[PDB]
Design a protein around this ligand. Structure first.
Ligand SMILES: CCCN(CCc1ccccc1)C(=O)[C@@H]1OC(C(=O)O)=C[C@H](N)[C@H]1NC(C)=O
Ligand SMILES: CCCN(CCc1ccccc1)C(=O)[C@@H]1OC(C(=O)O)=C[C@H](N)[C@H]1NC(C)=O
Ligand SMILES: CCCN(CCc1ccccc1)C(=O)[C@@H]1OC(C(=O)O)=C[C@H](N)[C@H]1NC(C)=O
Ligand SMILES: CCCN(CCc1ccccc1)C(=O)[C@@H]1OC(C(=O)O)=C[C@H](N)[C@H]1NC(C)=O
Ligand SMILES: *[C@@H]1O[C@H](CO)[C@@H](O)[C@H](O)[C@H]1NC(C)=O
Ligand SMILES: *[C@@H]1O[C@H](CO)[C@@H](O)[C@H](O)[C@H]1NC(C)=O
Ligand SMILES: *[C@@H]1O[C@H](CO)[C@@H](O)[C@H](O)[C@H]1NC(C)=O
Ligand SMILES: *[C@@H]1O[C@H](CO)[C@@H](O)[C@H](O)[C@H]1NC(C)=O
Ligand SMILES: [Ca+2]
Ligand SMILES: [Ca+2]
Ligand SMILES: [Ca+2]
Ligand SMILES: [Ca+2]
Ligand SMILES: [Ca+2]
Ligand SMILES: [Ca+2]
Lengths: 390, 390, 390, 390
């Protein structure tokens, strides 16, 4: 049948470039004739021949009459939807996979695994679908909003890994990893180290032996929790990123958190899911990350890279690698993903660009894509082009 | 060629969970740009690779100008349509299979069989289509609205079985079963037993030897007629389910119908098609059923199960297994179906949630899907989210 | 590669039944959200796995602003379009094949041949496309509106046959047949017999050796010109249908044309393209035909059949086989076609049901389908359901 | 795998004929329900099985609220999009390939290569995508709007050749050719000859050894720069076409540029991209070209041909071969392309017909297609049918 998929060396390249903007609300004007779906938390995952652009819809279109409530996180109507990357996610072009107010998905070489969380806050549920068939669930172990990545899970040899957490977004959230094979949970991994508060991990393969993730601590630090997961022993350890280039929002100024790598620092409450993707070379490993340009609001988005070293011990500043979204434009969640070329994998970061006018209007987002492409430096930024009054 | 489909053991699991809501009219606002089809009597049937969501449209969309007449059951415009499950059934997303005001469909491992009934009330006609070709018909035997399941037929080794009936909805309607192979009726099956009124059977496989069905009696009882059909002898027998948990609507209080299992009891006139699906295990069979929360109106929907026993003689209560639709929301027809996972079958029940504002406005429905998924207990209910005024 | 296609014996059956209605303007209301294409001259042709529903669009949608001019026959904007049968022919669901104000198409087993005529009236052009590639043309031989079938051409062993004509619709139109193989004209057949005025032939296989067509004489008779074409010698002869059941509109009363079979009779000026399809049995040949119910206007449509005999010598009345469209509904062009079942061919007649409100509004049509299905008699008629004011 | 595509001998034929009009804005009325994309610079490229219709959208639809800015050439929103040729390029029918305000694309027998340029004017960037993956980039060499063909690139044995240029549109712009294999630049080709200004080359294969291109000089002449590129040595040479039939717009009267073949002549500033395609025969080569009917404005389009000779030294007039667009209708860019029939290639020219109502309204285009088809002479012209006020 199809071979199972594995991480491969990345395609040659040394800079990212602007690739593609999916801005559905460019066609949502009241005088227009389209039906872009109102969504948030977009992410992309690719199989061998195609990528799918996922998001959590509020099950409402622009223009329409169900804008009230579209700025809330969880309810009984939100669903995980997708379109093939490059198609506009409208009512008709999308597929509704399952009810979900938190999601993930990934292809293993043979088939797609879709993950969607719903249920009441005190007792929510991870539901897993493999292709068409609902195949498994996982229960709330801390009875406070069981939730997951909002980005691609990661499969190697048929084993797909997924970060989940449950418990307080303001206190302790001890996260866990699930190992899922053909839609069924075959192992639960309890991490070690700094496990007190890890949210919305963005994960990817550092090699065939290691998954790494850069996550969000919503209460104590603007340094990102960083996961190293050994795929062969099914063990994970988490410690803060030591770089003075703190990747969360809010954050203090770079280099301002004194003391050892584990020091929490100021402006730690609050957070944002951040992009991270690997460039695997025969010789070395590139780790690419994104963060907003404002230190306090979800505005702008800049790319950074560092080759090798240990993210847990290295306080060195990451190398600035281009403005993907200026300060004038929204820069909300970002995520890594990889496109499969014939012989190598292309690392990319996607950027959620939320159209926020508060609760008295519709709330949704565009998705911008940057990928490793040629040499030199990143050349152009992305704007959504949407006027929320139309 | 591909080979013929057979029932397999069900996938492991012990509770149903909310899976998917297809709520087309969330996009039918006058100020929106979508064209959801006005439908009723939805059902789902799946082949090895995909499930189709079928319904009987009134050949009208919302917003639109043909709302008058969409509350009627039968006319020259109704058609059997489908979309791939997960797509919104809109004017352009749907395929129109055949003219029909009663329908069924099922896949035999190789091709789809579509069933549509139309024709004058006194001389209506079952029409069968195999793939793209119209292959056979069956004539009215009692000249009083020949009609069929409104849920999936059931194929084993190329033979597809279908319930049909003809007769007064407030008098005698003696059903029959058709055995259909590659779109052609190869055998008529005349049931034995309590045969005076059987409607809208929801049928599935209890094993490779037995199809069972939970049906509606619209005239005499609130207990469901229960068919056991032996596929090897092509014989069927019907008796009333003896459980005190009467699955019809209207119904009297549970356990209030005194006397032997076959006693009709009180609040017998009227009815609703009911969900039923099997959970086949190596040595145990789970029978899952749904019924409205109101005893008299089509409001809410609750799940019930019983393992083993004989439905014809067990008076014990069915075990309540979750509120799928609250008393506040519409609960009209329900039906069972199975999704084909790689090595096993996933039992599910779908729920038609009709938007009824009377004869004065459009009339149509959302479809809610619940499936056997994991263990523990059912966690959340389904709302359509539709404001019929928009 | 794919085998070339041949006519096969028809599937068992002895009556037609209502199969499917494609009524796109059921969704064309000004307050709705759809874009049905404004069309006329629909026809259907099938390959081994799918049928396509063709028509000549005016390149305009309802609702829209280009209604003026949609009641004219030829212009620089009309195009041959199609959708898979069962899909609604809207702006987006359709494929535009080529510029054309007269058309035909057919599948040969391996690929589709599309035929579209355009150009100025005095010097028009048959253009032939095989799949994606424009492959050949044929010139106007009489410089008066070169034109073709408005129904499926017919392929056997890779050879596809097509009737064309050129010359006066009120005087002499000597028609011709083209033999097209892989999109290229490989023979021109000059018919013999009554060749003075043959229009819009509806053709099909009587056997592997003979194509037959029932055509329209627009100036001299209400009897249909009937073509017998020997596929092996590539010769054709044409003579009038002798049946007293005159199939054209206008027409006099049945049996009223006195004298031999060739006698022209009264009310011969004017005409309509008529449905005709074969039921090939091992033993005998069924010839099915349709005609309007009004003897003078394009209202209603009735089915007729006769087995065996020679259409050129037999004055016997055809057997009335059901009202497909009542007198209250439009009955304009009709055409035969065949759907391919696994082992046999299903004969069908399609009916163009024009929405005509004159030139001050839009002009388009619905398509109704009837096919051979089971035994007994035809049970129900078709209405478009469209109110042209909406 | 499939194998690499090579030029083949053209299909038999001696005249072009009107083939297809894709006029999206026939459905863009304010009272309509469609969403045609606002585009410019359309072109078509075909693989073995299908042709794609590409254009540069302004990421806006008609009707809509983003018309301001749609007359500009370059901005952060323009994207390269396509549909299968024959589909209307609407918001939902199109795929968005990459951010781009100059584009090209072509199929090599195995996969599609997409080319998109964006970035700041002084430092723009060629981006290449092979299938779904971004594979390589090329940087600005003259820091003045690096840009490319706006028509199909050309592949032979897996090597795809592309013209690019960079420099002042009213001064020096020395083009270059990129040799691209599986999405990666494997060679730069620096032309020899009259190299001071070459833009928007329309290129194709004269044989297995030679690509030829008819280009635009926007600064010095109304004669088209003509590239002969030797694919075996990967060398190119450019000289002005010597024909008195000057193919650019503006242009002086035919034959009025006196002196030797390389003389620039009068009315040289300004220009338009021009159609050119080859008709390869066993011993003769036809070179087909198009130019506007007006000498000074983008109004009308006429076809011309010349067999054999050397474009660089023949001053003889090109033979006029039909009016494709009358003086009354828009004739803006034209381009050549070839459709792959079963054993031979069909040469065609497409014509962008821009709807220009100035900066005050939307700005976009229809695409007209003419192809070598049969013999005799070209018979009809193309109108867009669009009233820009609706
Ligand atoms: C911190 C990341 C996840 N949390 C915290 C959930 C939580 C709240 C209170 C107590 C416990 C848990 C968020 O809120 C996420 O934030 C955001 C956000 O933009 O900050 C978007 C997500 N839609 C939301 N996720 C869920 C599942 O609601
Ligand atoms: C009882 C279930 C089937 N019947 C009885 C039909 C009948 C009426 C009167 C005399 C004889 C027969 C219904 O009315 C069904 O009810 C309902 C319903 O919601 O109860 C929906 C179906 N659209 C309708 N089916 C048909 C075929 O009309
Ligand atoms: C008689 C059938 C074909 N003709 C005659 C064409 C003609 C007119 C005058 C002189 C010569 C030829 C028709 O008009 C057809 O009639 C009709 C019709 O509904 O009667 C529809 C067709 N759109 C039209 N065909 C063309 C190609 O215009
Ligand atoms: C001359 C053809 C390319 N140029 C020159 C670009 C340029 C301007 C000024 C200085 C340097 C370069 C054009 O302006 C093209 O013109 C036209 C046009 O209609 O003439 C359409 C193209 N959208 C545009 N291309 C770009 C890439 O902007
Ligand atoms: C990972 O392992 C697979 C399977 O053995 C191999 O094909 C692939 O190229 C490896 N990836 C690396 C070395 O990054
Ligand atoms: C039914 O029989 C088939 C073989 O005909 C077998 O493959 C399948 O697993 C059986 N299923 C059950 C439920 O017994
Ligand atoms: C026609 O000929 C083909 C090929 O020989 C055959 O397969 C087919 O069944 C024949 N059709 C008839 C007998 O009608
Ligand atoms: C070009 O060469 C290929 C083989 O490489 C051949 O198949 C093809 O017909 C040739 N075409 C021309 C136009 O010479
Ligand atoms: Ca934080
Ligand atoms: Ca829509
Ligand atoms: Ca009852
Ligand atoms: Ca006549
Ligand atoms: Ca549309
Ligand atoms: Ca010039």
């Amino acid at each position: 049948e199809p071979e199972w998929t594995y991480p491969r060396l990345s395609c040659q390249g040394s800079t990212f470039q602007k690739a593609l903007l999916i801005s559905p609300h460019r066609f949502g004007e009241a005088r227009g004739n389209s039906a872009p779906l109102i969504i948030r938390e977009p992410f992309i995952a690719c199989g061998p021949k195609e990528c799918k652009h996922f998001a959590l819809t509020h099950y409402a279109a622009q223009p329409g009459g169900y804008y009230n409530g579209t700025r809330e996180d969880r309810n009984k109507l939100r669903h995980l939807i997708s379109v093939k990357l490059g198609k506009i996610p409208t009512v008709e072009n999308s597929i509704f996979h399952m009810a979900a107010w938190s999601g993930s998905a990934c292809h293993d070489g043979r088939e797609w695994t879709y993950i969607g969380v719903d249920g009441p806050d005190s007792n929510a549920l991870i539901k897993i679908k493999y292709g068409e068939a609902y195949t498994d669930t996982y229960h709330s172990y801390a009875n406070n909003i069981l939730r997951t990545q909002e980005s691609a899970c990661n499969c190697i040899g048929g084993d797909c890994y997924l970060m989940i957490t449950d418990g307080s977004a303001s206190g302790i959230s001890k996260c866990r990893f699930l190992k899922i094979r053909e839609g069924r949970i075959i192992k639960e991994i309890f991490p070690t180290g700094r496990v007190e508060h890890t949210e919305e991990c963005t994960c990817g393969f550092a090699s065939n032996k290691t998954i790494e993730c850069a996550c969000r601590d919503n209460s104590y630090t603007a340094k990102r929790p960083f996961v190293k997961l050994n795929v062969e022993t099914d063990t994970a350890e988490i410690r803060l990123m030591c770089t003075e280039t703190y990747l969360d929002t809010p954050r203090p100024d770079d280099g301002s958190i004194t003391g050892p790598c584990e020091s929490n620092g100021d402006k730690g409450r609050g957070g944002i899911k951040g992009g991270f993707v690997h460039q695997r070379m025969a010789s070395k490993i590139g780790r690419w990350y994104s963060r907003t340009m404002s230190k306090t609001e979800r505005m702008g988005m800049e790319l950074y890279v560092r080759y090798d070293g240990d993210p847990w011990t290295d306080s060195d500043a990451l190398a600035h690698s281009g403005v993907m979204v200026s300060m004038k434009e929204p820069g909300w969640y970002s995520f890594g993903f990889e496109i499969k070329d014939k012989k190598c994998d292309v690392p990319c970061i996607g950027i959620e660009m939320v159209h926020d006018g508060g609760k008295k209007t519709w709330h949704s987002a565009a998705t911008a894509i940057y990928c490793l492409m040629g040499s030199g430096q990143l050349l152009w930024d992305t704007v959504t082009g949407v006027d929320m009054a139309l």
